[PDB]
Amino acid sequence: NYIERVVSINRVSKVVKGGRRFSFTALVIVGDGKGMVGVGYGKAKEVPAAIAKGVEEARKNFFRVPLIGSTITHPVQGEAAAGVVMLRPASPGTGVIAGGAARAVLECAGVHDILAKSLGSDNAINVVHATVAALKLLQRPEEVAARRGLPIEDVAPAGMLKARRESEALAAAAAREGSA
RNA sequence: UUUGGAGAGUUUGAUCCUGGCUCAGGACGAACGCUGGCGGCGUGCUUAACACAUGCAAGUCGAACGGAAAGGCCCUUUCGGGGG
């Protein structure tokens, strides 16, 4: 199972001596709802064709996300061509607060409680690319403790670890009610 | 030692960017239109500090005083009234 999107359809036109040889584009985002996120800019004369290209290309170019239960670690600035985005964690029960593009991205990714803001380059393309850049700038605290040699306790505060423990508890609960 | 930000359209054969314009939300001591069962609590000259009829809006003390017009009591009487 995969979640899939269609969040942009423009009607493009190369121009040639006869006239306008139109074509169709699409922007497609895929996400398992758990951390996998993929992106694709498909195009064709046919809208289903472009959509299917976007689907398969997203299924190619996944990217895993440093999540915590249902929310990100830290706020971040993501730069693309000109897409600026200021993501920032929420407190649970808040909602997937964003516009159209980033909302699609994060809802497909699996986020449920997060903030966001577009500050430049309103175009969905660059907006998505900037959001992705931000998600790449993210870091897991485990990998932070790894790269700087210290342990998680000196590396993180206590509230994040509260969240870790409680979310692991809910997850083990869900899985042990499911199978066991 | 913790809490809370959403965008869409628009220049172009088509694109991206800068950049402006417009829209959705909320607030009123409000007014206009259509409609108009009730109750509770609140609220009403933002303009001409323009003019003003009319009536009430700061009086009180006889345990401060001299006194005695109406009130009251008695002396009375013609009941005219007259004295305390």
From Swiss-Prot:
Span-the-membrane segments of this chain are none
Single annotated GO MF: rRNA binding
Sorted alphabetically, the keyword list is: Ribonucleoprotein, Ribosomal protein, RNA-binding, rRNA-binding
Q: Which GO terms describe its biological process?
A: translation
In terms of superkingdom, the source organism counts as Bacteria
Record's GO cellular component terms:
small ribosomal subunit
**Which ranges carry the S5 DRBM domain?**
2-65
What domain notes does the record hold? Answer: The N-terminal domain interacts with the head of the 30S subunit; the C-terminal domain interacts with the body and contacts protein S4. The interaction surface between S4 and S5 is involved in control of translational fidelity.
According to its UniProt entry, what is the function of this protein? With S4 and S12 plays an important role in translational accuracy. Located at the back of the 30S subunit body where it stabilizes the conformation of the head with respect to the body.
Family stated for the protein in its record: Belongs to the universal ribosomal protein uS5 family.
Q: How does it assemble?
A: Part of the 30S ribosomal subunit. Contacts proteins S4 and S8.
Q: What is this protein called?
A: Small ribosomal subunit protein uS5
What fragment of the full-length protein is this?
Answer: 35 to 214 of 214
